[PDB]
């Protein structure tokens, strides 16, 4: 039995694009992400995503919803990241890049797939048919998934 800890993703995803952030510092820059971080002391999951999202892109959302949980487990690392998804299309003003982050939108038929977290590719799909999921994958370092499982639900 190991511990979790409690993170966010927020995809801002609209009828035709995703705004997707691109790390730009320290270890794992490179690779677009949705937005997001860990949950703090006191504030709702929901809460903590609008704050993230509006820390990380400067978006302010009244709302977001939740479309998925999945669990990432990476080898050497006991503790598991429990990440919560979350989904936008409804905003009011536009990405700001920072220092550690990039926002760029992207169309729904060039979605970054090979420059996302690999686990992107099986529950994104999901996410773009409206359908809600609960995911657990494994990692060997950051490009190599050694296990797997991935679940449409009817209830997050
Ligand atoms: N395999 C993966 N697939 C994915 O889509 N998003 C992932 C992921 N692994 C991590 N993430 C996301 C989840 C969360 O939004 C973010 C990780 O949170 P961070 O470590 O950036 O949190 P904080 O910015 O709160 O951390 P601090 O450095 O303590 O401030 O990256
Ligand atoms: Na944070
Ligand atoms: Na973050």
């Known amino acids: 039995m190991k511990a979790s800890r409690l993170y ?13 952030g691109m790390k730009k510092r320290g270890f794992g820059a490179g690779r677009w992400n949705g937005f997001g971080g860990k949950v703090q002391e006191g504030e709702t999951i ?6 993230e999202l509006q820390e990380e892109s400067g978006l302010t959302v009244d709302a977001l919803h939740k479309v998925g949980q999945i669990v990432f487990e990476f080898v050497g690392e006991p503790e598991l990241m429990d990440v919560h998804v979350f989904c936008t299309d409804s905003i009011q003003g536009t990405p700001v890049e920072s220092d550690e982050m990039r926002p760029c939108w992207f169309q729904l038929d060039q979605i970054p797939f090979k420059d ?7 529950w994104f799909p999901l ?9 657990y994958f494994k990692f060997q370092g950051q490009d190599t998934i050694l296990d797997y499982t991935l679940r449409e639900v009817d209830t997050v």
């Open 8 to 20: 966010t993703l927020v995809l801002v995803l609209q009828p035709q694009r995703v705004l997707l």
């Open 46 to 51: 929901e809460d903590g995503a609008r704050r």
């Open 116 to 122: 996302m977290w690999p686990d992107n590719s099986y």
């Open 127 to 135: 996410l773009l048919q409206k359908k809600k999921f609960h995911g």
